């Protein structure tokens with residue numbers, strides 16, 4: 001349990017040391033143990049090495065892409081169902097319901113479509129969960145009910161770069177730079193770290209005999 | 214080689230060999246270049262990630278190759294049909310403002326030139342004279358030793374090579390002279406220091422960018438395809454190099470933070 005402080009200080013360091021732009025300026029050193037991307041970051045006079053998990057970082061990107069763009073498939077209801085709220089202005093302002101497979105007809109709410117999957121059941125408790133999830137929220141357009149969120153987390157995990165997969169500079173570069181598009185992408189959807197600071201390259205007086213007279 | 218001197222230098226290398234550090238290079242798994250300026254490369258050995266100073270390693274590597282192939286080197290023929298591309302020693306020494314007189318540059322070229330028969334025979338460092346024999350200002354470098362197949366060293370450090378051959382080599386002592394030349398060849402052979410250039414700076418020219426990118430690529434390719442495979446196959450690590458190899462990460466520690474989904 002007490003070992004988790006070393007994990008916390010790593011994510012704490014990242015929030016301060018790494019900005020959205022910092023990722024766009026990172027350079028790929030190479031692949032380490034077929035599972036990590038070693039990167040350099042020199043800005044401004046500061047120079048650091050970071051270690052990136054090829055799977056978790058690729059996954060955090062694919063996941064956040066699914067969360068923002070995907071329109072979930074719905075079941076067109078045979079007889080529409082009404083609902084009472086108060087909270088009524090949250091539904092009558094957001095097309096986050098349409099993205100989550102909730103097609104509506106605008107106190108007086110009308111449910112036209114409910115989301116559907118061949119591996120799970122959807123109900124009104126999921127519609128109300130999404131109604132309360134907006135209350136928490138920050139950007140609200142990428143908000144998803146836990147059932148959908150979990151399915152996207154699996155889609156991302158299955159489609160993302162596997163650990164043990166040899167990668168070329170081009171792919172590794174895209175994986176790291178893609179992180180500049182996300183907000184504080186320190187963890188994958190399952191809570192695993194995407195990256196960590198390795199070391200600062202401050203004072204290394206390397207061999208120079210060849211330029212000395 | 215018939216020489217008593219080369220054997221003393223080979224024994225001196227044998228006495229400095231670090232068994233454990235040699236095993237690290239023998240089984241290296243090349244990761245990549247970290248700094249082209251400071252010349253840091255990253256390698257994996259078993260469960261560890263190391264930061265290596267390849268300036269220091271290539272120095273000992275080329276020194277060791279020089280020691281092994283002494284008097285039996287192939288040649289890098291430096292001359293083309295373009296006479297204007299010739300390497301004039303006087304022209305190289307002109308990079309040194311402290312050699313403020315023709316005579317001081319001529320002093321260095323004179324020693325080098327009188328020793329041209331052995332520089333050619335033993336080292337494959339061939340010097341020619343285009344005009345009259347006594348014209349030091351027309352002394353030219355026609356060939357250099359070919360230490361590694363697939364490798365042609367950068368000639369940016371040629372001024373230093375000539376200046377140090379003319380001023381640092383102790384021509385008077387057979388052993389010190391021989392060691393000194395092999396050291397100069399090894400120093401010239403180390404891949405260049407490539408200073409960092411800011412690709413985000415709109416203030417810097419378009420032509421200076423793709424040129425840094427080309428130098429950055431040329432070294433990454435050189436280290437990966439020519440140098441590290443040679444290092445991995447024959448490098449004997451002297452103990453004075455332990456300061457140049459540094460452990461930066463270990464898989465057991467990394468696998469306590471980075472975990473499966």
Ligand SMILES: [Zn+2]
Pocket residue numbers: 055056059156157158474
């Ligand atoms: Zn995963």
Ligand SMILES: [Zn+2]
Pocket residue numbers: 056059157188189190191192473474
């Ligand atoms: Zn995950």
